[PDB]
Amino acid sequence: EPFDNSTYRNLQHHEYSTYTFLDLNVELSKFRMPQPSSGRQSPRH
């Protein structure tokens, strides 16, 4: 409310884990959409 410019609030990164990035990427997948397909399952296929 009083525009407390004097403090830092981006301290949420302190309580992060080893898998935090990948774990937070995991459940984010259900909000994604079907990826495009190039046909063959691999360039070598």
8 belongs to the binding site for other proteins (CB under 8 A) = yes
Q: Is there a contact between 19 and 26 (Cβ–Cβ < 8 Å)?
A: no
1 belongs to the binding site for other proteins (CB under 8 A) = no
Q: How far is the CB of 8 from other proteins (least distance, A)?
A: 4
What's CA 45's distance to the chain center, in Å?
A: 31
b/e map of 22-31 (b: 16 or more CB within 10 Å)? eeeeeeeeee
Q: How far is the CB of 7 from other proteins (least distance, A)?
A: 8
Which spans of this chain sit near other proteins (rule: CB under 8 A)? 3, 5, 7-10, 12-14, 16, 18-26, 28-29, 31-33, 35-43, 45
